[PDB]
């Protein structure tokens with residue numbers, strides 16, 4: 216019998232939910248006999264990204280493309296009960312999205328399958344210390360206020376309800392973050408992801424897309440993205456009426472000198488002296504309402520006009536291009552109340 220608090224036990228069950236992993240594979244139309252969870256590999260996913268990149272290169276420049284489309288389905292077997300040809304941009308992005316999720320699903324399954332309560336054994340595999348933040352604490356009030364105040368006006372499909380607040384420490388992240396611990400402009404920001412990705416995120420941290428993956432769909436190039444508006448990140452949990460509970464991170468991000476951009480720029484190397492990109496939004500949390508939570512700026516102010524009209528973005532976003540610039544601090548379990 217596990218001594219872990221019930222919210223921690225319930226979080227471990229959510230994270231290693233095989234049913235959720237299989238349902239996702241069914242939704243992606245993956246053939247679960249030819250490609251069961253146990254047969255997914257890192258080398259297979261790496262090669263599939265390369266094929267999707269090759270697919271775009273061939274399309275940009277019909278027999279040549281069909282061979283690439285067929286090599287993709289041979290590597291990742293699907294069950295269509297005819298296979299849709301990988302020619303249009305939406306078809307390629309749908310497959311990249313599938314791989315991005317399969318990558319962490321592979322991590323979750325490999326951990327799980329690789330005398331004690333199963334919940335305890337699987338908790339230890341995450342190599343992450345997880346503690347419940349009390350509802351009556353100063354931290355919980357600051358965090359609830361951050362959720363409350365930064366829900367965007369255009370994101371009106373749902374209301375957000377905080378279920379549990381966890382304080383997290385990934386093993387080895389302290390050591391990895393040490394070169395950036397004293398960098399200026401450290402901010403507490405949101406990062407949403409599908410619930411099926413959290414086993415991978417807790418065990419391996421937030422990661423950058425591999426070079427093999429297509430460059431399309433990355434407004435500021437391959438990096439780790441964050442928002443200062445909870446709903447902007449909460450949209451990336453991909454919660455539905457079917458699964459209305461999502462997970463969202465609060466990470467301390469060492470932004471340093473921000474390369475401030477109003478439009479897309481596929482960053483390969485930042486300008487010298489710049490440590491991050493700030494995508495400028497039209498609406499920003501009121502800077503006069505910034506609070507410090509144990510030395511880190513928490514931009515929990517209600518949204519006001521940023522005074523920037525000539526931008527592609529409604530809300531800010533922040534990108535770092537080195538995995539070491541992130542130190543995960545909190546993990547929230549959120550209820551999405553769909554309207």
Ligand SMILES: NC(=O)c1cccc2cn(-c3ccc([C@@H]4CCCNC4)cc3)nc12
Pocket residue numbers: 308311312315405406407408431432433434440441442447448449451532533
């Ligand atoms: N995940 C977040 O909380 C987040 C916050 C703010 C801006 C963000 C932008 N992203 C983002 C998420 C996904 C992607 C691509 C989309 C197409 C498939 N490959 C990944 C590019 C950017 N994630 C963000």
